[model samples]
Target: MYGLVNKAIQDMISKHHGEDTWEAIKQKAGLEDIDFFVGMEAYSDDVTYHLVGAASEVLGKPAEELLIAFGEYWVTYTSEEGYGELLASAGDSLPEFMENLDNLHARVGLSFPQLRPPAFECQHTSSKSMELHYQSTRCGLAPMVLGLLHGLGKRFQTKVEVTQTAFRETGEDHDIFSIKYED
Candidate 1:
């Protein structure tokens, strides 16, 4: 789940800045070779437009101006730290992390729309260990999963869980992601 979110962040950086900036930021964050993934359950057109607007602000241009531009060119653009990757990684626990987002979206009454059952997976192996993974993207499920495992320790929480809280741009290649969850 963390991996997926991290991947999304990387994608976000790549989309707005470039793959080069994404790599630079990852190296700067001391996670040069680590893999991160992001998945979501549902999306809203509003979120898409909102992200574009935010991107416009970051780029120092009016949203209207950006909307008028064609293709990938924008009126203005700049790269900076601070984005979903930083936000997701900031929390001590998954629930706490999600709760922070909950607070932010409380007024909207539209927390991440519940995702369909997820089917994302990954595997990793090294001289030291090997691992397989799965995740979920139901709107409020991640927090529930986290709460259920809070006192259970690693043995009970070995599986990774995920939820897609919002939609994000992935350039012209892929526009959406599948949500996943595990028990």
Candidate 2:
């Protein structure tokens, strides 16, 4: 994972909870010694996992719930932080953006050299529905993808319904989603 991720977690927590709570989470994650994160630097994935775990305990929320919130926050965070142009270039609608998600990540990969981006493949069933296959090198983030789609829906002003059809964590091949959207 990149330090940008940890920084986002910090920003999200600080903005939503408060700086003191963010500091408490950092201390609980056993990362109080760290002052700040450099966006382009690569970080151990464990650092992210630990932060989520500690945040779960400190905030009295489940990890999955926090991940969904974080996923939604990521859209706004990136747009405000410096990736607004890239996001705008993605598409004008939810489905269009979904179709171009892989390309978007590919472009982002150029900047973050060590990025291990998730894979998205869309199978359109109709003008308003599709099956999305999601494969990732990481685990426990399928819920985040759900949140991401919701975030995209909000961004594009589209109404969306997403249901997970396959679960990678449950020993399926990969995560798959059945999505329907309307503008």
Candidate 3:
């Protein structure tokens, strides 16, 4: 993972909790000596995993819940971090954006050689519904995907209902979501 990711975790925590709490989280994560993250540099995935674990302990929330919150915060964070134009250019609606996510990540990959982005396949069932297939190189992030969908709905001002019809963690082939949206 890049420092931008860890930095976002830091930002999310600092913004919601106080800096004091953020510092405590860092300490709990065994990262007190690290002063700051450099956005483009890559760090071990353990750094992020440890931070999330520590945050879960400090914040008294489940890891899945925190991951969901992080996923929601990510949409706004990327925009604020100068990806707003890139995000805007992706699509004007939730469904469109969902379909273009792979393309968007491909564009981003030019700047991040080690990027391991998730894959999304959308099967439109009707004017108002679709089946979303989510495949990732990682694990334990299905909850975050749900959060991202909610964030997208808020971004596009669409009323959305998302239900996970298939679970990757449960040994399913891939995660599939039944999504209904109203523009």
Candidate 4:
């Protein structure tokens, strides 16, 4: 984990909740390094977990929902954060991007070795549907994964319906998302 992620969480709170809300989360987390969340600065997973937990209390929103919203924000925000080219390299269309998603992550890993981004294997089941096989060591990001798919759909101007066919939380071996998309 890195402060960039914490900053992303802070940015998400600022964008949706308010700058004041983000400040509140920072104060509650009591993390002195929060102010210096540079893109490559190192941070512990505890900091992010605490920050999200505090934001949950301040906003009275569940952590799951907040994470999903954060995922949506990450898609747009990361695009604007000089990774626009990286995203462009993923593909021009939604399906194309999903098909190359894992490769894109591998490219990202080459640039930032600290990241342990989840793996994705997308399989087109039909003209309008696919199964996105998602695997990660972390838990409770299934909803965020769903949100990321939705965000990418919107990014490509594609109408999408994403359903969680299976989830780690529900005792599944991995998270499997069924996505139906159309132009």
The candidate scoring highest on lDDT is: 2
- Stretches > 4 Å off in candidate 1: 35-183
Q: Provide the overall lDDT of each model, using Cα atoms, as 2-decimal numbers.
A: 0.36, 0.94, 0.93, 0.84
Q: How close is candidate 1 to the true structure, as a TM-score?
A: 0.23
Error of 1 at 80 (Å): 25
Give the C-alpha miss distance for residue 141 in model 3, angstroms: 0.7
How much lDDT does candidate 2 score?
0.94
The prediction achieving the highest TM-score against the true structure is: 2
- Per residue, candidate 1 scores C-alpha lDDT tens digits across 39-96 of 3333343333434445455556655444433111210111122243444342544334
Candidate 2 on 1-183: residue-level lDDT in tens? 999999999999999999999999999999988899889999999999999999999999999999999988999999999999999999899988988999999999999988999999999999999999999999999989998999998999899999999999788999999999997
Candidate 3 stretches greater than 4 Å from native: none
- Which sections of candidate 4 miss by over 4 Å? none
What's the best-to-worst order under TM-score? 2, 3, 4, 1
**Model 1: which ten-residue window has the lowest total lDDT?**
70-79
Better of 2 and 4 by lDDT: 2
Clashes of 4: 0
lDDT tens digits, residues 55-171, model 3?
999999999999999988999899899799999989999889998999999998999888888999999999899999999988888888988888888888999999999998788
